[PDB]
């Protein structure tokens, strides 16, 4: 028995559920009048709900995620909360559905064969990174630490807009202070962003490729980092490397990443 939030409650009978998207449940669905300024207009959305096997605590976690998404509020470059169903029936949390899946798969699927030019230009790739940096700057301004930023946790819209996912609630993405000291800050997220930038300019590459998940720590400690990937401009590699300074205070801020990437896009 949960409160009725008049800012968020959406009628349970305007929500037509569809095929599962992922188990543990999340279900795609048609929503009628998610935009109250076109209230017969239908839209595809994603709906999180509990599986019948779920404890007192599993309900608490879905409640807190719904509550944190309300508090963080709306931005173009995150998965936005759209509505909830809390009354006389199971708890539904309704959010944006992105047609083209996660950014890792978007890029892999758009690999050209061998040495040929692929549909993803330098500016589109820099734009991807720009949009992720703007999303993270927003989440940081609302006191949200992601803790797991990676191309698999960014989703892509029908219009190729980047949307950070799973910010409500992977050693090769983690800052040294997060690996050894279990310390997560905004600057930890900046390390991860560096890794995500590498992923973008390798079109969805597996970071530290070859290198076993047990040799990494020693390579980082000795001051080793991934090499510049083929065809990546030095300006972009230098941003990755700045992200991978050992000292968190020497990494750029998301604000500075937004400015640097902005400068590159203006220069096209
Ligand atoms: C929209 C059509 C469709 O079915 N798209 C699929 C394409 C391939 O990838 C899976 C589907 N897309 C998609 N889009 C958005 C999703 C959002 C969530 C999600 C997130 Cl990211 C979230 O972040 C805080 C919170 C919640 O619920 C509280 C949810 Cl449901 C999950 C899956 C998504 N899949």
Residue 106 Cβ contacting ligand 1 at under 6 Å: no
Instruction: Give, as one character, the DSSP assignment of residue 9.
Output: B
Q: How was this structure determined?
A: X-ray
Strand ranges in 87-202 using DSSP code E only, listed in sequence order: 92-96, 154-156, 162-164
Q: Please check whether residue 199 is in contact with residue 151, taking contact to mean a CB–CB distance below 8 angstroms.
A: yes
Q: Please check whether residue 140 is in contact with residue 186, taking contact to mean a CB–CB distance below 8 angstroms.
A: yes
Give CB contacts under 8 A, 24+ apart, made by 216-224. Answer: 216/171, 216/172, 217/179, 217/180, 220/176, 220/246, 221/176
Q: Report the candidate in 38, 37, 33 with the shortest Cα–Cα distance to residue 83.
A: 33
27 Cα to the center of ligand 1, angstroms? 9
At 6, list the tokens: 């008049």
Residue 99 Cβ contacting ligand 1 at under 6 Å: yes
| Smallest CA separation from ligand 1 atom 22, residue | 166
Q: Please check whether residue 78 is in contact with residue 154, taking contact to mean a CB–CB distance below 8 angstroms.
A: no
* One-letter-per-residue 3-state SS of 18-79: EEEEECCCEEEEEEECCCCCCCCCEEEEEEECCCCCCCHHHHHHHHHHHHHHHHHCCCCCEC
Beta partners for residue 92, in sequence order: 85
148 is catalytic: yes
Domains and their CATH numbers in the chain: 1-97 (3.30.200.20), 98-266 (1.10.510.10)
At 212, list the tokens: 């076993």
**Distance separating alpha carbons of residues 93 and 58, to the nearest angstrom:** 14
Query: 61, 148, 166, 262: which is the annotated catalytic residue?
Result: 148
Given phi > 0 = left and psi -120 to 50 = alpha, else beta, which region is 18? beta
Q: Please name the residue ranges forming H helices in 94-157.
A: 103-109, 122-141
Cα–Cα distance list, 84 to 54, 64, 66, 131 (Å): 19, 13, 8, 27
Q: What Å resolution does this PDB entry report? A: 2.3
Q: Please check whether residue 203 is in contact with residue 231, taking contact to mean a CB–CB distance below 8 angstroms.
A: no
**Distance separating alpha carbons of residues 189 and 140, to the nearest angstrom:** 9
At 54, list the tokens: 């779920």
Q: Please check whether residue 160 is in contact with residue 124, taking contact to mean a CB–CB distance below 8 angstroms.
A: yes
Sort strands 154-156 and 92-96 into parallel, antiparallel or unpaired.
Answer: unpaired
Name residues whose C-beta falls within 8 Å of residue 184's C-beta, 6 or more positions apart in sequence: 145, 147, 178
Cα–Cα distance list, 109 to 6, 51, 104, 105, 137 (Å): 42, 32, 9, 6, 28
Given phi > 0 = left and psi -120 to 50 = alpha, else beta, which region is 166? left
Any idea which residue has 């001051």 for tokens?
A: 223
Atom of ligand 1 nearest to the CA of 96: 15
Cα–Cα distance list, 37 to 32, 41, 96 (Å): 12, 9, 17
Cα radius of gyration (the chain): 20
**Distance separating alpha carbons of residues 92 and 149, to the nearest angstrom:** 25
Q: Report the candidate in 156, 99, 109, 108 with the shortest Cα–Cα distance to residue 131.
A: 156
Given phi > 0 = left and psi -120 to 50 = alpha, else beta, which region is 245? beta
Q: Please check whether residue 239 is in contact with residue 251, taking contact to mean a CB–CB distance below 8 angstroms.
A: no
98 Cα to the center of ligand 1, angstroms? 6
Residue 258 Cβ contacting ligand 1 at under 6 Å: no
155 Cα to the center of ligand 1, angstroms? 8
């Amino acid at each position: 028995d949960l409160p009725l939030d008049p800012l968020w409650e959406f009628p349970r009978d305007r929500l037509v559920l569809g095929k599962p998207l992922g188990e543990g449940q999340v279900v795609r669905a048609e929503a009628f009048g998610m935009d109250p300024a076109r209230p017969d207009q239908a839209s595809t959305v994603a709906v999180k709900m509990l599986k019948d096997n779920a404890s007192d605590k599993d309900l608490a976690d879905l409640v807190s995620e719904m509550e944190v998404m309300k508090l963080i509020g709306r931005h173009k470059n995150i998965i936005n909360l759209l509505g909830v169903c809390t009354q006389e029936g199971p708890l539904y949390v309704i959010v944006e559905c992105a047609a083209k899946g996660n950014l890792r798969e978007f890029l892999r699927a758009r690999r050209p064969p061998g040495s040929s030019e692929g549909p993803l230009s330098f500016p589109v790739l820099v734009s991807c990174a720009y949009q992720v940096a703007r999303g993270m700057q927003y989440l940081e301004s609302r006191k949200c630490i992601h803790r797991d930023l990676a191309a698999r946790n960014v989703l892509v819209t029908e219009d190729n807009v980047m949307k950070i996912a799973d910010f409500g609630l992977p050693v090769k993405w983690m800052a040294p202070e997060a690996l050894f000291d279990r310390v997560y800050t905004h600057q930890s997220d900046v390390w991860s962003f560096g890794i995500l930038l590498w992923e973008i300019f390798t079109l969805g590459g597996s970071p530290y490729p070859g290198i076993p998940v047990e040799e990494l720590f020693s390579l980082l400690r000795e001051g080793h980092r991934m090499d510049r990937p083929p065809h990546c401009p030095p300006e972009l590699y230098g941003l990755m490397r700045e992200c991978w300074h050992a000292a968190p205070s020497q990494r750029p801020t998301f604000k500075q990443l937004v400015e640097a990437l902005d400068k590159v896009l203006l220069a096209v």
